[PDB]
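Whiteboard transcription, Tuesday session. T.W. wrote the structure tokens on the left side:
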């Protein structure tokens, strides 16, 4: 029974479920993933307490991004263009 014999991490899996948050990026994501898996809260006790998941917002550096790393470089760049 194929399409089962071979299952690999989905496209961009690290941070798929990760919800667009500005409060606790990781916690918020370690939860979308939590409910996502279907694992009820009351079921996993101590575990689902202090935990993080890669977040779709957190970006590669600590900083809690609010838009693509690229469109952010684009902001700084644009805001600096003396009249040719």
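and on the right, the sequence the group agreed on:
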């Amino acid at each position: 029974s194929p399409a089962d014999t071979n299952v690999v991490p989905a496209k961009d899996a690290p941070t798929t479920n990760s919800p667009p948050s500005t409060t606790s990026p990781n916690q918020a994501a370690a939860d979308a993933n939590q409910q996502q898996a279907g694992i009820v809260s009351s079921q996993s006790g101590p575990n689902a307490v202090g935990d993080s998941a890669p977040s779709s917002s957190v970006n590669n550096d600590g900083d809690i991004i609010t838009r693509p790393t690229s469109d952010s470089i684009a902001a700084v760049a644009n805001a600096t263009k003396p009249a040719a």
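Someone added at the bottom: The radius of gyration is 18 Å.
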